[PDB]
């Protein structure tokens, strides 16, 4: 009775600006994963084990987030681009030092990197939400996870 | 001090009839999607039969979970869901499925169209549902994104280069 | 030495009457699943929780049974039809009431529905078994499960 | 290269009003957990087992919700206060009776207290959403869960 | 539509002879469980560990079989009676010795008792199958399991 | 090497016949409790059937585990348990369980009485068992705890306040 | 007041040589099916390679379990199974598998025909096996319907519209 | 049948009001320990944050399980536990936990002191509890063991050798 | 707040040197039992090899867990365990285990004797340990129960009836 | 950059001699699996259960090893041949007796068969390793597992 | 009677700069393989899309595990891995992946060639790595055969008869 | 066919030098396990929890390694000797201190003892690999695991 009598019903399509914003999020997530693995390998010093395990947890979370963002881009008829050259040439995260680093320096660096990653998502959020609340919810989840990880990492260096 | 309330019977949030009707529309489309997905799951045949067979079962599981969530939300908001077969058949908006064995390309086309119809209904309902209750709007967002991911995974088989 | 010299060996094929009997079973299983979900949602009153959980168990069992029957139909070169219009127009289960119902009424209604579903299987059993004992075994399993569920549901209203 | 230069990138901090609203939510969640445990221990009568198990599920949900809220406060650079004296002096939930109670009375009391807990979250939701949609999402999840638990508990005493 | 009009469709009820046959099976299953536990505790000698574990497996199988039979009786509107006095007065298994026994004697005794238990089921099978193939299937499963356990236990004393 | 004992065969602790009989009483009562719990589990009908149906299964599982533990302790202490049906029927102390279907209130009363009888037997045996072997007294403590919790969970249904 | 049997040595059910031979036929066909399924699993190439690769592993697992069940039933009925390689090769009825790499369609056809041959053997044996022992006939029914489901899942790839 | 008791209603062990208050003290101290453990878990900062953050969660879980066990034992022995927030705040013996963020050394000292206070309360009540019911004394032994192991694992951080 | 203690540092229970030595004896015997159990597990041959091979692994796991529990209790009670190889070898009381391959009967006899020696040591220590700390006496009870069950399960192989 | 400018890069290809040596290994693994199952079924006598379970473990290990070897052949562009006629006509293991056998005879036979299977691998090891250390590692694992299984089986008959 | 060493600071094995460089080459190729595998996983479209989608995810997981293992081995051998994005992009040897959506056959070809390049690099490095440290050569063998199995499973899709 | 005729094919037998080398490995593994447990119990100071958990992981690894070595010795027809007196008299690890130690001292001591254990295996590796590459593979795995544990432990005391 209420059935729709057509055979071609097409889905929601993302705008190029929306795809660009999601690309901006994805590149930073991938770079965060790579730098987290770097710090996970080369951290050394007092209280080494806790940082060694927390950085692995952060890397797992960032990998899951990047996969979720790229699959959302695919679902919205966009084309993600996560190649190494593109990530290196278009990421906004500061470069990571190349040698062994103490735990305090690693804590500071990782906190700054997570803060930059969250800032990118916060800048993208209003424009994304103006079109797709479903994508805005994914952004909310990413922000929650990243901020929790940032707290758990930064609390080591607090003085009170 | 003491900030405790004295009232002994505090009542909860009650939904409006229009809100209940919108949730009923979403529920009936989810149920019809589950039934049609099982039909396609059984009667599909041809190339990539195994992949279509498994993906349609995943879609059916997702749709069943979504319909249960929507109906329980209506129950929590003091509404009465109606998921009877006669009501679903008479009030669903998805086009009817073909009766006999179908090739995999035809099944891909049909399932993509029906998933698109379901998400279109949810998107039509989302504005009023969000205006009344963002807690229910969150469930609507979850359904929309899950269904769109399933639609991508199913439709990508027929896409050319 | 004893190897068969054939290149195409064909399997067992079901008769249209056998397919019709299995369709009769399948339609009632699907309608039972739908009515069980409806009662699961709309039940209310004393001893609400046990009915709420038992009806979910019954729905899971009925869904598994319908899938098994339809896959057996496919294996025997038959075509199941589980569309909503077909189920609504050809089911034998009585119609379910549309509003909130007390637990005693739900117990009575669900017991009646399960009894009708079992009666259909018992009616088609001899004709099915005359051709396919392998399908008769599936019918035996369905009857066992449905009767156990009916006992567990109906025992609530017993007075002794 | 689009990499940032800043080496001390800072994060998002919450306002005192935001911290106060989250404290208002947290104290009610803790008090709900304590009262749920009390009702779980001291309930007697018909449907005792179902009430016993449902109240334990509600307590588990309230505990995880309070933990989530407090960790979000820590992530946003706020300081939660979940001490017994603070909860007792600042909670808004009505006081729970001290002796053994029948299941109908426990159902009424627990439904009332869950409704009060949900009302607090609904009161703070507008401001917390205007400041941080990421926290608004957590409060949406809390409201959904609490309302489902309220329905499951309260359906026992419905007449028809 | 083909929906039924009746609102009080009744189920299948068992005859007193059917109930008696199922009681005959049930008492032997319970006695087999008790004697298996006795032999499990009081066995000594060579291959003690293997006998100790195999008898526990046999007891578990007998317990689940007795539960299945009694629940089938309940589903078919019969009343099982598995009290200690009834089992002791009406069982057909030979009495078990009261003290510590070597493994060869335990093997012989347990094999004889399993054979008697299987013989009872084979005696009642024809009538129970003529009445209810659904119950005949459960008895087929019981016979299969008991005979496999009997083989596994009895193979220890075989010469070559 | 300095403190090593030169003994070639060191034997363990052996239980007296009084201790063996004290454990035999507990064993036969646990077995009879398991049998009566299964009977009540099968034949209970009436209002609130499901909760009692499941709690009786929990009680039967606990009683079976306890009887196995007691019999294995008897074996470890060089005693010979006797859990045969004739012995249990002739020497158990639990009152006989009635036949036919019973309502849930009657089943609650009967099961509470029989659990209390079992706990009373364990308490009577505990003094001598503890005076001889605290390791066995600990097992008795565990059994009393479990049985009393089961008794509370079962009897609270029929309470009136 | 005692129905206990006096006989101290009670013997079980013994199978006939014809029954043992029928079960031997079923066993040897199951073993040959497992071997050929593994061969096809290794040597298949072409389109839908992954799907056939996984499905053939599932079929091989099913056939191995079925052969074990049949042989253990033979042992329980006081018969002696013979699953040696020479006996299987000299007495199996399945046509031999090709020696080299095969395409997907060829593997589908070959495996479908071999599964059909195995099911035909079991169906030929079922009448006598059921006439002697319905307990073994039940295992035969389980093998038949499992193999037919596997045959449907494998053969559905090559069907047209 | 010969030794069966003819009693129709056998009642169980009942706890005295002194015993009930003795268990109430343990209950309120365990609840306050759980609350203060959660507070310290949230608000701890400084060097070696993660290990203390996780150990405090372990301590809170143990204390919650212990309080549940004590209250259920009170219910089984016909007593009425009182774990309301007002009662805990008014009648607990643990010293008040300071507010705001605290370094890890201060948290270690505070948590060690409060665990020691809880164990001291349990040790004070143990004599009378054991003199009345060894079954409850066993629960007290388990609580003391767990709390002392947690105290060692937490306090070992500040040891200087 | 009314009953809160004003103490700023509350210390816990401390063990005496005699108590520490009483626990040290149990510790060294458990460690030596683990080492000899592994030795017998590796070097046993003869009839019924597999059952003894697996039971000795179970015994070794139990002894390792028990030694860890005892040492952690010593740490909790402010004692210092010493489980070094030289100390164990010089102060253990278990008789030396013979070298080379041994038959299963000899291994059964040796392992039974050494388990009995360990249990005898624990029983000798139990009186003073219980007189000082029932919480530690409970751990001793658990160890005695487990070791005696293992001894029964191992020694029952050589029984002749 | 250091990126390679090729569109089709060839892999490692196995020589026919290497394929033949792996075929020699595979045939013996398959024959060992079949003979292990036969001994597992037909073993009987004292200590029956231990052999019954150890032979299952041996068969599982041999099946896994044969699958690994055949998949390595496929990866190295070779074609395995595991047909029944080929195995029967080209295996090196001695024929297995056709009837029920005591546990001592089964121990001797299985030990001999495992020794022959290990001897084949040891014979082909040097030639395999001269080309592919990656395949040599698989051979090492097979030898370790087979020798451990042989020790566990053969220790039953040891007299000291 | 003591073979204990007197030296108080025994140092471990240290790798050479050439060894570190070879392991760095292996690591950078593994990282680039993971990135390109994820790219192909996202942007593959056409026939057999589901199988390619799942297999590429399996390959990415394997490559990630291998890169972690290699970097941890360098850390254990006192070397410093460098897995930064700029370094990977500037020093990897795998040819770059195309930018847009690609069909199934093209993805199969590209991934096969890149896996072959990675395993070729590992084979080039293996000789020196084995000459210095067989413990690291073992990890190299594991990487080689895992990657070759993945390459077979992926490339078999396009193979003809 | 190609079937062998021999019925008593024998296996590979180890030389006394091989047995001595494996005994040298085994005694050091056992002593490492004992000293790891000692350090696990008696460690105090900063990062106590991390040292406590890492030493337990090291003890588990050493236990499984010693079991693997002894079972390989048994498979190769050798007789391991892991008695307490033998370990104490023939081990090469330095003696461990007897009282409570700070975490830095425990880190130094455990790193030294792990290095000695690895040096023993590296000393015996050439001969054991010249005789049996299958055993050389087990020693490769042991070396890899021990060196990873040594890195994870010593990284705590590294300056920068």
Coordinates of N, CA and C in Angstrom, one line a residue, chain B residues 28-153:
Chain B
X28 N 9.0 -0.6 11.3 CA 8.4 -1.4 10.3 C 9.3 -1.5 9.1
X29 N 10.0 -0.5 8.7 CA 11.0 -0.6 7.6 C 12.2 -1.5 8.0
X30 N 12.6 -1.5 9.2 CA 13.7 -2.4 9.7 C 13.2 -3.8 9.6
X31 N 12.0 -4.1 10.0 CA 11.5 -5.5 10.0 C 11.4 -6.0 8.6
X32 N 10.9 -5.2 7.7 CA 10.7 -5.6 6.3 C 12.1 -5.8 5.7
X33 N 13.1 -5.0 6.0 CA 14.4 -5.2 5.5 C 15.0 -6.5 6.0
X34 N 14.8 -6.9 7.2 CA 15.2 -8.2 7.7 C 14.6 -9.3 6.9
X35 N 13.3 -9.3 6.7 CA 12.6 -10.3 6.0 C 13.2 -10.5 4.6
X36 N 13.3 -9.3 3.9 CA 13.8 -9.4 2.5 C 15.2 -9.8 2.4
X37 N 16.1 -9.4 3.4 CA 17.4 -9.9 3.5 C 17.5 -11.4 3.6
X38 N 16.7 -12.0 4.5 CA 16.7 -13.4 4.6 C 16.2 -14.1 3.3
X39 N 15.2 -13.5 2.6 CA 14.8 -14.1 1.3 C 15.9 -14.1 0.3
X40 N 16.6 -12.9 0.2 CA 17.8 -12.9 -0.7 C 18.9 -13.8 -0.3
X41 N 19.1 -13.9 1.0 CA 20.1 -14.9 1.5 C 19.8 -16.3 1.1
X42 N 18.6 -16.7 1.1 CA 18.2 -18.1 0.7 C 18.3 -18.2 -0.8
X43 N 17.7 -17.3 -1.6 CA 17.5 -17.6 -3.0 C 18.6 -17.0 -3.9
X44 N 19.7 -16.5 -3.4 CA 20.7 -16.0 -4.3 C 21.5 -17.2 -4.9
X45 N 21.9 -17.0 -6.1 CA 22.7 -18.0 -6.8 C 23.5 -17.4 -7.9
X46 N 24.7 -17.9 -8.2 CA 25.5 -17.4 -9.3 C 27.0 -17.2 -8.8
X47 N 27.7 -16.3 -9.5 CA 29.1 -16.0 -9.1 C 29.1 -15.2 -7.8
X48 N 30.2 -15.5 -7.0 CA 30.4 -14.8 -5.7 C 29.2 -15.1 -4.8
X49 N 28.6 -16.3 -5.0 CA 27.5 -16.7 -4.2 C 27.8 -16.7 -2.7
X50 N 29.0 -17.3 -2.3 CA 29.3 -17.4 -0.9 C 29.5 -16.0 -0.3
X51 N 30.1 -15.1 -0.9 CA 30.3 -13.8 -0.4 C 28.9 -13.1 -0.2
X52 N 28.1 -13.1 -1.2 CA 26.7 -12.6 -1.1 C 26.0 -13.2 0.1
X53 N 26.1 -14.6 0.2 CA 25.4 -15.4 1.2 C 25.8 -14.9 2.6
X54 N 27.1 -14.7 2.8 CA 27.5 -14.3 4.1 C 27.2 -12.8 4.5
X55 N 27.4 -12.0 3.5 CA 27.1 -10.5 3.7 C 25.6 -10.3 4.0
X56 N 24.7 -11.0 3.3 CA 23.3 -10.8 3.6 C 22.9 -11.3 5.0
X57 N 23.6 -12.3 5.4 CA 23.3 -12.8 6.8 C 23.8 -11.7 7.8
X58 N 24.9 -11.1 7.6 CA 25.4 -10.0 8.4 C 24.4 -8.9 8.4
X59 N 23.9 -8.5 7.2 CA 22.9 -7.4 7.2 C 21.7 -7.7 7.9
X60 N 21.2 -9.0 7.8 CA 20.0 -9.4 8.5 C 20.2 -9.3 10.0
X61 N 21.4 -9.7 10.5 CA 21.6 -9.6 12.0 C 21.6 -8.2 12.4
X62 N 22.3 -7.3 11.6 CA 22.3 -5.9 12.0 C 20.8 -5.3 12.0
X63 N 20.0 -5.6 11.0 CA 18.7 -5.1 11.0 C 17.8 -5.6 12.1
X64 N 18.0 -6.9 12.5 CA 17.3 -7.4 13.6 C 17.6 -6.7 14.9
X65 N 18.9 -6.5 15.2 CA 19.4 -5.8 16.3 C 18.8 -4.3 16.4
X66 N 18.8 -3.7 15.2 CA 18.3 -2.3 15.1 C 16.8 -2.2 15.4
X67 N 16.0 -3.2 14.9 CA 14.6 -3.2 15.1 C 14.3 -3.4 16.6
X68 N 15.0 -4.3 17.2 CA 14.9 -4.6 18.7 C 15.2 -3.3 19.5
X69 N 16.3 -2.6 19.1 CA 16.6 -1.4 19.8 C 15.6 -0.3 19.7
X70 N 15.0 -0.2 18.5 CA 14.0 0.9 18.3 C 12.7 0.5 19.1
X71 N 12.3 -0.7 19.0 CA 11.1 -1.1 19.7 C 11.3 -0.9 21.3
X72 N 12.4 -1.3 21.8 CA 12.7 -1.2 23.2 C 12.7 0.3 23.6
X73 N 13.3 1.2 22.7 CA 13.2 2.6 23.0 C 11.8 3.1 23.0
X74 N 10.9 2.7 22.1 CA 9.5 3.1 22.2 C 8.9 2.6 23.5
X75 N 9.2 1.4 23.9 CA 8.7 0.9 25.2 C 9.1 1.7 26.4
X76 N 10.4 2.1 26.3 CA 11.0 3.0 27.4 C 10.3 4.3 27.4
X77 N 10.0 4.9 26.3 CA 9.3 6.2 26.2 C 7.8 6.1 26.3
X78 N 7.3 5.0 26.8 CA 5.9 4.8 27.0 C 5.1 4.8 25.7
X79 N 5.6 4.1 24.7 CA 4.9 3.9 23.4 C 4.7 2.4 23.2
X80 N 3.8 2.1 22.3 CA 3.5 0.7 22.0 C 3.9 0.4 20.5
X81 N 5.0 -0.3 20.3 CA 5.4 -0.8 19.0 C 4.4 -1.8 18.4
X82 N 4.3 -1.9 17.1 CA 3.5 -2.8 16.4 C 4.3 -3.5 15.3
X83 N 4.7 -4.7 15.6 CA 5.6 -5.4 14.6 C 4.9 -6.7 14.0
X84 N 3.6 -6.6 14.0 CA 2.8 -7.8 13.4 C 3.0 -7.9 11.9
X85 N 2.9 -9.1 11.4 CA 3.1 -9.3 10.0 C 2.2 -8.6 9.1
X86 N 0.9 -8.6 9.4 CA -0.1 -7.9 8.6 C 0.2 -6.4 8.6
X87 N 0.5 -5.8 9.7 CA 0.9 -4.4 9.8 C 2.1 -4.1 9.0
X88 N 3.1 -4.9 9.1 CA 4.4 -4.7 8.3 C 4.1 -4.7 6.8
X89 N 3.3 -5.8 6.4 CA 3.0 -5.9 5.0 C 2.2 -4.7 4.5
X90 N 1.2 -4.2 5.3 CA 0.3 -3.2 4.8 C 0.9 -1.8 4.9
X91 N 1.9 -1.6 5.7 CA 2.5 -0.2 6.0 C 3.9 0.0 5.6
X92 N 4.7 -1.1 5.2 CA 6.1 -0.9 4.8 C 6.2 -0.1 3.5
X93 N 7.3 0.6 3.3 CA 7.6 1.4 2.1 C 8.5 0.7 1.2
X94 N 9.2 -0.3 1.6 CA 10.2 -1.0 0.7 C 9.4 -1.7 -0.4
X95 N 9.9 -1.6 -1.6 CA 9.3 -2.4 -2.7 C 9.5 -3.9 -2.5
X96 N 8.5 -4.6 -3.0 CA 8.4 -6.0 -2.8 C 9.6 -6.8 -3.5
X97 N 10.0 -7.9 -3.0 CA 11.1 -8.7 -3.5 C 10.6 -9.7 -4.5
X98 N 11.3 -10.0 -5.6 CA 10.9 -11.0 -6.5 C 10.8 -12.4 -5.9
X99 N 10.0 -13.3 -6.5 CA 9.6 -14.5 -5.9 C 10.6 -15.6 -6.0
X100 N 11.3 -15.7 -7.1 CA 12.1 -16.8 -7.5 C 13.6 -16.6 -7.3
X101 N 14.3 -17.6 -7.8 CA 15.8 -17.6 -7.7 C 16.3 -16.4 -8.6
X102 N 17.3 -15.7 -8.1 CA 17.9 -14.5 -8.7 C 19.4 -14.7 -8.8
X103 N 20.0 -14.1 -9.8 CA 21.4 -14.0 -9.9 C 22.0 -13.0 -9.0
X104 N 23.3 -13.0 -8.8 CA 23.9 -12.3 -7.7 C 23.9 -10.8 -8.1
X105 N 24.1 -10.4 -9.3 CA 24.0 -9.0 -9.7 C 22.6 -8.4 -9.4
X106 N 21.6 -9.1 -9.8 CA 20.2 -8.7 -9.5 C 20.0 -8.5 -8.0
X107 N 20.5 -9.5 -7.2 CA 20.4 -9.4 -5.7 C 21.1 -8.2 -5.2
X108 N 22.3 -7.9 -5.7 CA 23.1 -6.7 -5.3 C 22.3 -5.5 -5.6
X109 N 21.7 -5.3 -6.8 CA 20.9 -4.2 -7.1 C 19.7 -4.0 -6.2
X110 N 19.0 -5.1 -6.0 CA 17.8 -5.0 -5.2 C 18.1 -4.7 -3.7
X111 N 19.1 -5.3 -3.2 CA 19.4 -5.0 -1.8 C 19.9 -3.6 -1.6
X112 N 20.7 -3.1 -2.5 CA 21.2 -1.8 -2.4 C 20.1 -0.8 -2.5
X113 N 19.1 -1.0 -3.4 CA 17.9 -0.1 -3.4 C 17.1 -0.2 -2.1
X114 N 16.9 -1.3 -1.6 CA 16.1 -1.4 -0.3 C 16.8 -0.8 0.9
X115 N 18.1 -1.0 1.0 CA 18.9 -0.3 2.0 C 18.8 1.2 1.9
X116 N 18.9 1.7 0.6 CA 18.8 3.1 0.4 C 17.4 3.6 0.8
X117 N 16.4 2.9 0.5 CA 15.1 3.3 0.9 C 14.9 3.4 2.5
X118 N 15.5 2.4 3.2 CA 15.4 2.4 4.6 C 16.2 3.6 5.2
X119 N 17.4 3.9 4.7 CA 18.1 5.0 5.3 C 17.5 6.3 4.9
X120 N 16.8 6.4 3.7 CA 16.0 7.6 3.4 C 14.9 7.8 4.4
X121 N 14.2 6.7 4.7 CA 13.1 6.9 5.7 C 13.7 7.4 7.1
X122 N 14.8 6.8 7.5 CA 15.4 7.2 8.8 C 15.8 8.7 8.7
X123 N 16.4 9.1 7.6 CA 16.8 10.5 7.4 C 15.6 11.4 7.4
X124 N 14.5 11.0 6.8 CA 13.3 11.8 6.9 C 12.8 12.0 8.3
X125 N 12.8 10.9 9.1 CA 12.4 11.0 10.5 C 13.3 11.7 11.4
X126 N 14.6 11.7 11.1 CA 15.6 12.2 12.0 C 15.4 13.6 12.5
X127 N 14.9 14.5 11.6 CA 14.8 15.9 12.0 C 13.9 16.1 13.2
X128 N 12.6 15.5 13.1 CA 11.7 15.6 14.2 C 12.2 14.8 15.4
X129 N 12.7 13.7 15.2 CA 13.2 12.9 16.3 C 14.3 13.6 17.1
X130 N 15.2 14.2 16.4 CA 16.3 15.0 17.1 C 15.7 16.2 17.8
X131 N 14.8 16.9 17.1 CA 14.1 18.1 17.7 C 13.5 17.7 19.1
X132 N 12.9 16.5 19.2 CA 12.3 16.1 20.4 C 13.2 15.5 21.4
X133 N 14.1 14.6 21.0 CA 14.9 13.7 21.9 C 16.3 13.4 21.3
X134 N 17.3 14.1 21.6 CA 18.7 13.7 21.1 C 19.1 12.3 21.5
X135 N 18.6 11.8 22.6 CA 19.0 10.4 23.0 C 18.5 9.4 22.0
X136 N 17.3 9.6 21.4 CA 16.8 8.8 20.3 C 17.5 9.1 19.0
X137 N 17.8 10.4 18.8 CA 18.6 10.8 17.6 C 19.9 10.1 17.5
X138 N 20.5 9.8 18.6 CA 21.8 9.0 18.6 C 21.6 7.6 18.1
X139 N 20.5 6.9 18.5 CA 20.2 5.6 18.0 C 20.0 5.7 16.5
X140 N 19.3 6.8 16.0 CA 19.1 6.9 14.6 C 20.4 7.1 13.8
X141 N 21.3 7.9 14.4 CA 22.6 8.0 13.8 C 23.4 6.7 13.6
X142 N 23.3 5.9 14.7 CA 24.0 4.6 14.7 C 23.4 3.7 13.6
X143 N 22.1 3.7 13.5 CA 21.4 2.9 12.4 C 21.8 3.4 11.1
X144 N 21.8 4.7 10.9 CA 22.1 5.2 9.5 C 23.6 4.8 9.1
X145 N 24.5 5.0 10.0 CA 25.9 4.7 9.6 C 26.1 3.2 9.4
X146 N 25.5 2.3 10.3 CA 25.7 0.9 10.0 C 25.1 0.5 8.7
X147 N 23.9 0.9 8.4 CA 23.2 0.6 7.2 C 24.0 1.1 6.0
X148 N 24.6 2.3 6.1 CA 25.3 2.8 4.9 C 26.6 2.0 4.7
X149 N 27.3 1.6 5.8 CA 28.4 0.7 5.6 C 28.0 -0.6 5.0
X150 N 26.9 -1.2 5.4 CA 26.5 -2.4 4.8 C 26.2 -2.2 3.3
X151 N 25.5 -1.1 3.0 CA 25.2 -0.8 1.6 C 26.5 -0.6 0.7
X152 N 27.5 0.0 1.3 CA 28.8 0.1 0.5 C 29.4 -1.3 0.3
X153 N 29.4 -2.1 1.3 CA 30.0 -3.4 1.2 C 29.3 -4.3 0.2

